[PDB]
Design a protein around this ligand. Structure first.
Ligand code: VCA
Ligand code: B7G
Ligand code: B7G
Ligand code: CA
Length: 261
């Protein structure tokens, strides 16, 4: 359980460029990091696109452009999560179609959980910590686009109050992905068995890492339930956009995820 935990933690370190530790020293102005360029209005968003942060489909409008940048980040994160998941021997022994089912229904729960690592009450890191976008700027955009990020901030700040670290997060994200009750899963008993091992490891770890945090394990099982519901709401928002924002482009991978939800 301890060697198991360490292995998943190494896979997490190996596969995610931004960790919470890195994100926190950037956000607190630690000596070994260059400060991010702050995106707080339309002119700074435009400067960031010119080269101060970033070196997409045809430009439509400000709100849509921000949406396109949201898609770039989540699709890149899906890439990192796939590699992370593959780095767990038990995951890679599953038939490839089961691996796809798990990632399809698990990646957004994992994304919204990890998002908390790069967030404070004022905004979020973007572009590998090279930028900071303000929560206020995001709320200012047109209706469907402002409404989709705000609930993630809301979840994140309460989640952040639990004070997890990267070693905790490794096990938590592994438990999210390796979930046996996903629709269309083929070998349910094997996946459920892998997941309980991960969960046991997580409880074993939290006892050592957070000794005075009695109730932390059941608190986290509830966050998994909350994430499932936050993704259900997000998929409905995404379907509305597809239906009503017909000039707005959506990445083919994302179309494949939200199909059937
Ligand atoms: C300049 C704008 C930078 C982008 C800010 C958002 C970046 C990361 C947050 C990821 C969650 C955003 C929620 C919207 C996700 C829509 C795409 C998807 O569903 O995959
Ligand atoms: C390891 C070899 C892979 C064999 C491929 C078997 C194809 O199964 C397909 O897997 C998909 C989930 O991933 C589902 O969306 C489809 O409904 C299902 O038909
Ligand atoms: C690595 C990216 C994670 C994969 C997420 C996308 C999963 O899409 C699914 O892929 C299957 C083909 O394999 C299709 O049968 C399903 O219709 C489709 O919904
Ligand atoms: Ca389970």
């Amino acid at each position: 359980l301890k060697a198991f935990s360490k292995h998943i933690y190494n896979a997490y370190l190996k596969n995610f460029n931004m960790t919470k530790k890195k994100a926190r020293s950037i956000l607190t102005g630690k000596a070994s990091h260059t400060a991010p360029f702050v995106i707080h209005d339309i002119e700074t968003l435009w400067q960031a696109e010119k080269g101060l942060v970033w070196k997409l489909p045809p430009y439509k409008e400000i709100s849509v452009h921000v949406f396109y940048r949201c898609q770039c980040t989540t699709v890149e994160t899906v890439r990192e999560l796939t590699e992370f998941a593959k780095s767990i021997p038990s995951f890679s022994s599953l038939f490839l179609n089961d691996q796809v089912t798990l990632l399809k229904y698990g990646v957004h729960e994992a994304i919204f959980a990890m998002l908390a690592s790069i967030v404070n009450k004022d905004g979020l890191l973007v572009a590998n910590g090279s930028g900071f976008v303000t929560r206020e700027f995001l709320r200012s955009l047109r209706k469907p686009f402002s409404d989709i990020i705000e609930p993630k901030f809301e979840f994140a700040v309460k989640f952040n109050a639990l004070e997890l670290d990267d070693s905790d997060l490794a096990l938590f994200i592994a438990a999210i992905i390796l979930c046996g009750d996903r629709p269309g899963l083929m070998n349910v008993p094997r996946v459920e068995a892998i997941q309980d091992t991960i969960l046991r490891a997580l409880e074993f770890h939290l006892q050592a890492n957070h000794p005075d945090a009695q109730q932390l394990f059941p608190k986290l099982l509830q966050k998994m339930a909350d994430l499932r519901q936050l993704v259900t709401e997000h998929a409905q928002m995404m379907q509305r956009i597809k239906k009503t924002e017909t000039e707005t482009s959506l990445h083919p991978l994302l179309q494949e995820i939200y199909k059937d939800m």
